[PDB]
């Protein structure tokens, strides 16, 4: 069974041994070189349609926490931008650091942010998530950087439930959460073809990374860092530094939606 993680002994440098696609041609995350990314006037504005989102549950899965949505019909969808068709929101989660100077997966001119939010969506033309991840255009992940400054009011409900899901395998009800409160003002973005950033690292993602970070407070991110990778009663390993470093860009172009 899976035994990968973020530690010295099972972290990103080890993943290729059980997931050889780790060394593939379209791995994520990557560094976004802002001077090399080309404005593409053919890209569209994103359409983020979360008005009818139905959050259900929050789960500590031993790698991050996922806020899960009802994806049994088109309630919260992502369309437009670089995408063809309709992508349904299934879950969001974050990656973060042990200190504010690292935590993001993507970097911008080598700058690491304190954390990165991933809103994960699957292409409805493949019928279910498991089928979608087997396709090069199966997922669309909306990535949003977090910097530390003022509090993000819409994040507080998430932070306040974390005490109840401290350890791997714990979940809690998480209904009526509006993910619109996690977005920045601008939907300007970069996009490129990549992969999931956790094993099995499937090369199925169209990445859409927002240029504008959101601000969260130090206190909010400190609460992320109180979670545990371990299960209940096991030796405590704080859930920190659950980010994969930037991978080689190889034969890919990062496109900008903005001039």
Catalytic annotation, residues: 63
Closest residue to ligand EVI: CB criterion: 196
Burial 42-68 (b: 16+ CB within 10 A, else e): ebeebebbbeebbbbbbbbbbbbbbbb
Joined tokens for residue 82: 């670089």
In the bound state with ligand EVI, the residue whose beta carbon lies nearer, of 164 and 190, is 190
Least distance (Å) between residue 210 CB and ligand EVI: 14
Site string for ligand EVI, 105-124 (x = CB under 6 A): -------------x-x----
In the bound state with ligand EVI, the residue whose beta carbon lies nearer, of 23 and 38, is 23
**Residue 16 marked in a binding site:** no
**Residue 34 marked in a binding site:** no
Q: Which does 3 bind (CB under 5 to 8 A by kind): ligand EVI, Zn ion, none?
A: ligand EVI
In the bound state with Zn ion, the residue whose beta carbon lies nearer, of 82 and 194, is 194
- Residues of this chain, 6-65, that bind ligand EVI according to CB under 6 A: 10, 14-15, 17-18
Q: How many CB atoms lie within 10 A of CB 128?
A: 10
User: What dihedral angle (degrees, nearest 10) is formed by the CA atoms of 63, 67, 68, 69?
Assistant: -150
Q: Which does 18 bind (CB under 5 to 8 A by kind): Zn ion, ligand EVI, none?
A: ligand EVI
Number of DSSP helices (H) and strands (E) in the chain, helices first: 3, 15
**Residue 197 marked in a binding site:** yes
User: Which of 196, 209, 216, 246 touches ligand EVI (CB under 6 A)?
Assistant: 196
Check if the beta carbon of residue 139 is closer than 8 Å to that of residue 204: yes
How many angstroms separate the CA atoms of 130 and 230, rounded? 26
Element (H, E) at 145: strand 139-148
Q: Contact positions toward Zn ion, by CB under 5 A? A: 118
Check if the beta carbon of residue 222 is closer than 8 Å to that of residue 158: no
User: What dihedral angle (degrees, nearest 10) is formed by the CA atoms of 72, 53, 133, 125?
Assistant: 60
**Residue 198 marked in a binding site:** yes
Pairing state between β 205-210 and 189-194: antiparallel
In the bound state with Zn ion, the residue whose beta carbon lies nearer, of 116 and 137, is 116
Least distance (Å) between residue 45 CB and ligand EVI: 22
Query: Near ligand EVI by CB under 6 A, which window of 153-161, 167-175, 191-199, 213-221?
Result: 191-199
Length of the chain: 259
Binding residues for ligand EVI (CB under 6 A): 3-4, 10, 14-15, 17-18, 118, 120, 141, 196-198, 205
């Amino acid at each position: 069974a899976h035994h990968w993680g973020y530690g010295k002994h099972n972290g990103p440098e080890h993943w290729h041994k059980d997931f050889p696609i780790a060394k593939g041609e379209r791995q994520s995350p990557v560094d976004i070189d802002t001077h090399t990314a080309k404005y593409d006037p053919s890209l569209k504005p994103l359409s983020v349609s979360y008005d009818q989102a139905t959050s259900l549950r929050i789960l500590n899965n031993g790698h991050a926490f996922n806020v899960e949505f009802d994806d049994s019909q088109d309630k919260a969808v992502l369309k437009g931008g670089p995408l063809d068709g309709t992508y349904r929101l299934i879950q969001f989660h974050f990656h973060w650091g042990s200190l504010d100077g690292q935590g993001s997966e993507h970097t911008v001119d080598k700058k690491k942010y304190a954390a990165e939010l991933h809103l994960v969506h699957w292409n409805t033309k493949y019928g279910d998530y498991g089928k979608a991840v087997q396709q090069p255009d199966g997922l669309a992940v909306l990535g949003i950087f977090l910097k530390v400054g003022s509090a993000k009011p819409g994040l507080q409900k998430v932070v306040d439930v974390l005490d109840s899901i401290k350890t791997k395998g714990k979940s809690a009800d998480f209904t009526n959460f509006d993910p619109r409160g996690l977005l920045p003002e601008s939907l300007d973005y970069w996009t490129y073809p990549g992969s999931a950033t956790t094993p099995p690292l499937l090369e199925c993602v169209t990445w859409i990374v927002l240029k504008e970070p959101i601000s969260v407070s130090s206190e909010q991110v400190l609460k992320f860092r109180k979670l545990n990778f371990n299960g209940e009663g096991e030796p405590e390993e704080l859930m920190v530094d659950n980010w994969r470093p930037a991978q080689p860009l190889k034969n890919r172009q990062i496109k900008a939606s903005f001039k």
